[PDB]
Amino acid sequence: KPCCDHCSCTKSIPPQCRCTDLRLDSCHSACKSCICTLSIPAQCVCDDIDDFCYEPC
Amino acid sequence: KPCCDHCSCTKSIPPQCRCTDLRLDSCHSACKSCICTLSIPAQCVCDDIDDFCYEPC
Known part of the structure; x- marks a missing residue:
C-alpha cells in the first residue's frame, strides 16, 4: 500500500x-x-527514486 | 566516517x-x-536510532 510519511x-x-x-x-x-534488516520484525527502507512523492500514510 | 546530511x-x-x-x-x-542494496555500487542506509544527529557531511 503506497504511502510515504x-x-x-x-x-x-x-x-x-x-x-x-x-x-x-x-x-x-x-x-x-x-x-530490510535481517531481524524480526524486519525494518525496511524503499530506496526507489521517483519524480513524485507517494501520498502521506 | 560518521556524518549525516x-x-x-x-x-x-x-x-x-x-x-x-x-x-x-x-x-x-x-x-x-x-x-544495503544487492548491487554494485551498493546503496546503503543506516537505521540506527540515537538521541543525537551526526554532524553534517
Missing part, C-alpha cells in the same frame, strides 16, 4: 524524490528496491 | 533521531545496523 526531493527539474520512511516487515506495494 | 528526530525527550541518508558502498563508521 516523509519524502525528500531535490529542487531541480525533473525533481528527484525518495521516501526515507523505515517501515515494519515490508515496503509499500509499489516499492521496487526494498532493503 | 539529513537527520530526522522526534520532538520528544529523549529525542529519537535517525539518519535517512542513502550512501554509496557503505554506511558511516559508527553505524551498527547498515542495510
